[PDB]
Design a protein around this nucleic acid. Structure first.
Lengths: 261, 289, 152, 589
DNA sequence: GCAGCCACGCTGGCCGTTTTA
DNA sequence: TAAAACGGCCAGCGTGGCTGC
């Protein structure tokens, strides 16, 4: 279902980037600007620099109004298409955030406050039991520290478990800053509002407290004092003794962040 | 259905007066021994830090939603525990049991509120610190006790269940007799006011009557009478009917008149006795204020 | 004296002198429970002890009872159920009696029912009682065997 | 008849009775009102819902209407379902009206769409309608809320879903090769699932006729439907929900926690006047009519009132090609002897300013700016803007300017010169600009300003900042009798009854706002001749600097902004210079 | 060569064991 | 000492192999 929709969007965007990028003539860049971007990346070995207008150029927004709604749905499709290209060749504010904005693209500007340290990540759990073939590598990486997989195919069972291999993996570093809202848009008698933002990967350390920036359109929500909030707090009683309950909050994630302003 | 589940009413006991006891009780908090639990007492004191009234859950309804019955859980303790999926007579002896949940409109509540009573500070020993005590209020008598008053409180003395064997006590109120009857609650007023007017030389007698315990300072009493008057008030500003007269001079005038102003008119405060939070934030009690 | 009070001058009746200081709070304690059964129309009886009251190492019997034998509702009663107050205070020795130059050191003595709130912080009091040591001294799960004084 | 098990209502009597109400309203409230266009409300309002493509209602339409009185108490007792049935039959009325043309606004998609207070409120009122008022304290961030869940699996990864129930979400054991033969473990994605929006806002009331605060739990459509500090009346229904013990287990404590689930908000991110503006603009006596109508409390300081008028029409914000960046800010302080009600004048200025900030003396520090403080709920240190940031655009008001501290009044050099704020500590190293019209007042050393004495001497101000100001005024005491008679007759009339001139209260207020962007006064060549002509005579007094020249050029164009003049004129410059010269002739002593 | 009975394997429910407040 | 969670112990159901018709 989503595999088919994302696969058609994926093939059309792969054809899009494989088509012309910029309409300009020989005076300047002619064509294959994103192809020259990857060759520029081959010169530097870092990432991708994408425009919203260039993605909006080929399908006249048909493909843009496909990605701008559920981007979170289309992350691995966008990575797999770029991966096949590799093997083939080698603005709003905090008030504009709703639940319909999850997965979609929206740009937010603001005021940077309280930079944070550098901490590595994981997303490569290689955890298997006491059985001889202890060389698995869980393809899970979600927002859960569940290293050992249940069903291996050794003589070991699901309860047989051991630690995750911290030596055969690919990690990344990141920081977590909390952006403040501008003081030039807050009304009178109003205190500033806060919002968390996550800076992932290569674009790390670009932050500076006290700056105006433009952000990636994507957005996430992280699983979790929000007890007795009140609100109907869900539980995980599956359909058939007695799990935890939960109450979340809106967060933010990005991959391309320019720091203009 | 149990008859306790369908009540809609309440019952109040009634204390005996001392006149018939004379023919046929003034206790202190120190006199409240922790051995009179279950007995009938009568105390007096000062209402201090009155909490707010919040609803008390009494019985819990449980909708079957499958067999259509109603399960009921009566709770008289502070806490309780959740029950099973259904306790219907038809959900039982069947493979598919129901699934219940509570209900609000079928449950029964009751008025609940508590406060603290401070000692009279006249019956306190010469080298002790006055204690206080918690009194629970329920039902009709709720929202009827202002803090910082003098009242006769009657009740029954019951402990509460919770290092292993420490019994924390309280009092359940039964009758309220308030000393110092609140005003504004005209006949008896003009019964003395019309006589006061026809008394002759009223203006000098009025200002002469406020704090007559000093000698002299007649114009000072005139200023005190005018401070006691006050009382004054489109697309502009109103007028404040407040007077602010300062006093300079020393020394035999010095607190004799200063405490007397709050006597005739009042919280007496000093310099260091009030901090920056005193004359103008605490953890909220039982009921971020 | 509290200075030479430990190890020996132990597990006996000791006469202690000193100053009344830092009086604790007054809490009452339950001893004898009265419970009424509805259908039998009878009363019942149940007691509980702690290490302050028995003076002898007896098996502690702590939960408030209901539905004991047949299914009769053990409605508890009051008034007739007994209670006794409880209090603990500290007494350091007299400061002039101290050695060459030091901060005086102290212990505590627990009172009983008719003697609650007899010492305010700040007086001169002679005390006669019994040196009682309670608690599992670290053999529970690092220095234990905390002390107090009873029979006062 | 249709009936619900727990309630006593029906589908059709409610539907037809609501349709009866939606087809009958003839100003019945005026029939009770006795009247002291008679078409029903819902036809026109349903058309405004219809052609615009765009629920709650008030109370008097159902009281005056005799029918649906039972429907009133049914909604009063069961608001949860009656509103849904009302929207269903309103949708049906939309379809009953749309069959006239059958192509209207794309029928499928439009088809798809205070007696007493809180303290008096008994717990008996479990599910009732409560009319309340008050103010708003703060606003929590957005809380998400799942409406439809999301599930996946492991073998070929089927991803069916189910929705949220009223309290929990269920999930089967096996989904691939359905709920049989236990093939693999079900996956759960709590980010592919649907959500909702909910926000909690705590409110404080103003108990008209101990303090108490209330809260509420608005939803999707009511997100930011309230601001903080507004006088909002609150319509809602009471709730009460249990709480856990020690936030961990299922042992529910007694005394359930209660809240409010609001319905309607009283909050209220029932051009053409320009010709009248030009009529008054064509008046010859505008320079006296506009200034005289500003403050009817004082009948003097006409030059000062004119300067105050020009404070909002101050200069032309001229930035050069490279560098320059010269704003139109002007700052004028007035001072002098008491018994002038100067503070009431300044508060009136604070009232005229749409974003006025009225500060005072000895309550400020450098750290009116840099309001950095600690957070409470998140337990962090959040940097906040100061009072002058609230003055960004407009006029600020400061009292007792002579009584500032060492840090206070020294920060003002940056504002008078760069009109910036320099933040540079460990938290944030970043500057920003915040322009305003600084205006203040103070009192001299001597109770009476004596003559034959320097003005810089009898004022506790630093002389570089003293001449940095635009214009300095002097208020002196007069020994007359005539001004005291008009003073006491004027003030006696203002004091009596507790309250031949045209007094526009709001014409000037919108005139300045209209003239701020639509008026750009130009200062061409013809004025420079008179400028140098006046400037040589100005420079003749010595023993006058370029500071006074910048004062005259920013004050002449300020008057040119007045009376809607996009160019400069050789005239209006004489009194522009003379306004400064009146102060200068006061500097003889 | 096919059906019924017995033996072995798999699935579901209840009781026992462990830790925090 | 009580309550909650997970593992072990006990009970019920299904499939394959062996025996009889």
């Amino acid at each position: 279902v989503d595999d088919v929709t994302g696969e058609k969007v994926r093939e059309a965007f792969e054809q899009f980037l494989e088509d012309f990028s910029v309409q300009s003539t020989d005076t300047g860049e002619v064509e294959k600007v994103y192809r020259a971007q990857i060759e520029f990346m081959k010169i530097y070995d870092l990432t991708i620099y994408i425009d919203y207008q260039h993605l909006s150029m080929r399908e006249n927004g048909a493909l843009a109004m496909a990605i701008s709604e559920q981007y979170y749905r289309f992350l691995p499709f966008l990575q797999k298409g770029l991966r096949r290209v590799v093997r083939k060749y080698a603005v709003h504010r905090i008030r504009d955030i709703r639940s319909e904005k999850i997965g979609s693209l929206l740009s937010i500007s603001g005021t940077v406050t309280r930079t944070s340290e550098v901490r590595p990540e994981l997303y490569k759990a290689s955890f298997t039991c006491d059985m001889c073939r202890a060389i698995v590598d869980n393809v899970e990486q979600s927002f859960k520290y569940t290293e050992p997989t249940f069903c291996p195919n050794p003589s070991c069972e699901n309860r047989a478990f051991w630690t995750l291999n911290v030596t055969r993996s690919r990690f990344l570093d990141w920081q977590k800053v909390r952006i403040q809202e501008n003081a030039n848009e807050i009304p009178t008698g109003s205190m500033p509002r806060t919002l968390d933002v996550i800076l992932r990967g290569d674009s790390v350390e670009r932050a500076k407290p006290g700056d105006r920036c433009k952000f990636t359109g994507v957005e996430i929500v992280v699983p979790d004092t929000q007890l007795g909030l009140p609100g109907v707090k869900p539980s995980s009683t599956l359909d058939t003794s007695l799990v935890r309950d939960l109450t979340y909050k809106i967060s933010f994630l990005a991959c391309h962040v320019i720091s203009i302003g | 259905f149990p008859p306790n589940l369908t009540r809609r009413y309440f019952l109040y006991f009634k204390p005996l007066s001392q006149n018939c006891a004379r023919r046929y009780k003034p206790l202190s908090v120190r006199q409240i021994k922790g051995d009179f639990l279950g007995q009938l007492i009568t105390v007096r004191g000062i209402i201090t830090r009155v909490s707010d009234v919040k609803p008390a859950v009494e019985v819990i309804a449980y909708t079957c939603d499958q067999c259509g019955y109603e399960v009921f859980q009566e709770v008289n303790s502070r806490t309780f525990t959740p029950l099973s999926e259904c306790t219907s007579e038809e959900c039982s002896q069947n493979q598919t049991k129901g699934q219940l949940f509570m209900s609000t409109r079928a449950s029964k509540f009751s008025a609940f509120q508590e406060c603290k009573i401070q000692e009279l500070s006249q019956q306190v020993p010469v080298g002790h610190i006055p204690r206080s005590l918690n009194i629970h209020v329920n039902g009709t008598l709720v929202r009827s006790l202002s803090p910082g008053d003098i009242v006769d409180v009657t009740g029954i003395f019951l402990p509460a269940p919770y290092a292993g064997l420490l019994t924390e006590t309280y009092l359940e109120a039964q009758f309220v007799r308030q000393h110092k009857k609140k005003f504004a609650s005209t006949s008896d007023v003009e019964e003395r006011v019309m006589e006061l007017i026809t008394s002759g030389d009223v203006y000098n007698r009025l200002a002469k009557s406020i704090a007559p315990e000093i000698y002299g300072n007649l114009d000072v009493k005139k200023a005190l009478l005018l401070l006691l008057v006050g009382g004054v008030d489109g697309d502009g500003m109103k007028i404040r009917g407040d007077i602010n007269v300062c006093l300079m001079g020393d020394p035999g005038v010095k607190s004799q008149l200063l405490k007397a102003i709050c006597k005739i008119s009042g919280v007496y405060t000093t310099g260091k006795g009030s901090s920056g939070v005193g004359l103008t934030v605490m953890k909220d009690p039982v009921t971020m204020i | 004296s509290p200075r030479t009070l430990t190890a020996q001058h132990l597990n006996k009746l000791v006469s202690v002198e000193g100053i009344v200081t830092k009086t604790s709070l007054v809490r009452p304690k339950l001893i004898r429970s009265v419970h009424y059964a509805a259908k039998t129309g009878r009363f019942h009886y149940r007691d509980y002890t702690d290490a302050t009251t028995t003076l002898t190492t007896r098996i502690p019997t702590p939960i408030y009872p209901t539905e004991d034998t047949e299914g009769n509702k053990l409605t508890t009663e009051y008034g007739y159920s007994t209670f006794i107050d409880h209090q603990r205070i500290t007494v350091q020795e007299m400061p002039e009696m101290a050695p060459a130059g030091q901060l005086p050191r102290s212990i505590d003595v627990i009172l009983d029912d008719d003697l609650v709130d007899k010492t305010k912080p700040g007086d001169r009091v002679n005390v006669v009682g019994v040196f009682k040591s309670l608690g599992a001294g670290g053999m529970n799960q690092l220095i234990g065997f905390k002390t107090l004084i009873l029979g006062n | 008849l249709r009936i619900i098990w727990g309630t006593n209502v029906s589908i059709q009597e409610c539907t037809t009775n609501f349709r009866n109400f939606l087809m009958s309203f003839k100003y019945k409230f005026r029939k009770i009102l006795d009247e002291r266009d008679e078409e029903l409300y819902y036809i026109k309002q349903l058309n405004e819902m219809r052609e615009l493509g765009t629920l709650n209602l008030d109370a008097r339409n159902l009281l005056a209407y005799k029918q649906t009185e039972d429907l009133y108490h049914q909604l009063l007792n069961y608001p949860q379902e009656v509103i849904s049935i009302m929207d269903q039959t309103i949708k049906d009325c939309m379809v009953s009206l749309i069959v006239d043309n059958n192509l209207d606004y794309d029928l499928d998609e439009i088809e798809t769409k205070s007696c007493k207070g809180m303290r008096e409120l008994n717990p008996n009122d479990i599910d009732k309608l409560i009319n309340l008022k008050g103010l708003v304290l703060r606003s929590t961030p957005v809380i998400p809320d799942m409406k439809v869940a999301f599930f996946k699996c492991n073998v070929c990864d089927h991803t069916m879903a189910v929705e949220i129930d009223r309290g929990v979400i269920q999930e089967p054991a096996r989904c691939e090769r359905i709920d049989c033969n236990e093939p693999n473990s079900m996956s759960l994605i709590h980010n592919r699932c649907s959500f909702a929006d909910k926000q909690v806002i705590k409110l404080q009331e103003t108990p008209d006729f101990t303090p108490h605060s209330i809260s509420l739990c608005v939803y999707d459509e009511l997100v930011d439907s309230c601001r903080a500090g507004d006088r909002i009346e609150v319509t809602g229904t009471f709730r009460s929900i249990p709480i856990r013990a020690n936030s961990r287990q299922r042992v529910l404590k007694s005394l359930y926690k209660t809240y409010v689930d609001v319905v309607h908000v009283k909050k209220v991110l029932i051009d053409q006047d320009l010709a009248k503006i030009r009529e008054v603009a064509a008046r010859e006596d505008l320079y006296s009519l506009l200034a005289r109508s500003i403050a009817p409390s004082i009948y003097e300081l006409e030059d000062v009132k004119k300067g105050i008028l020009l404070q909002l029409f101050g200069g032309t914000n001229k930035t050069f090609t490279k560098g320059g960046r010269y704003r139109g800010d002007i700052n004028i302080l007035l001072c002098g002897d008491p018994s002038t009600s100067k503070s009431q004048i300044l508060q009136y200025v604070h009232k005229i300013t749409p974003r006025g900030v009225y500060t005072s003396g000895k309550g400020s520090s450098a750290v009116l700016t840099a309001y950095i403080t600690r957070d409470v709920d998140t337990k962090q240190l959040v940097l906040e803007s100061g009072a002058l940031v609230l003055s960004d655009g407009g006029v600020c008001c400061i009292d007792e300017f002579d009584k500032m501290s060492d840090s206070t009044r020294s920060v003002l050099h940056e504002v008078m010169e760069q009109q910036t704020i320099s933040i540079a500590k460990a938290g944030i190293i970043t500057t920003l600009n915040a322009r305003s019209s600084i205006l203040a007042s103070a009192n001299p050393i001597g109770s009476r300003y004596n003559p034959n004495l320097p003005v810089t001497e009898n004022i506790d101000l630093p002389p570089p900042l003293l001449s940095r100001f635009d214009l300095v005024y002097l208020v002196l005491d007069k020994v007359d009798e005539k001004n005291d008679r008009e003073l006491a007759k004027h003030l006696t009339n203002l004091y009596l009854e507790d309250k031949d001139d045209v007094l526009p209260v709001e014409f000037l207020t919108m005139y300045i706002s209209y003239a701020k962007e639509h008026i750009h006064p130009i200062i061409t060549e013809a004025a420079k001749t008179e400028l140098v002509r006046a400037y040589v005579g100005m420079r003749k007094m010595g023993d006058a600097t370029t500071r006074q020249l910048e004062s005259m050029i920013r004050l002449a164009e300020a008057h040119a902004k007045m009376k809607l003049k996009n160019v400069v004129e050789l005239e209006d410059v004489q009194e522009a210079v003379r306004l400064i010269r009146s102060a200068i002739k006061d500097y003889a002593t």
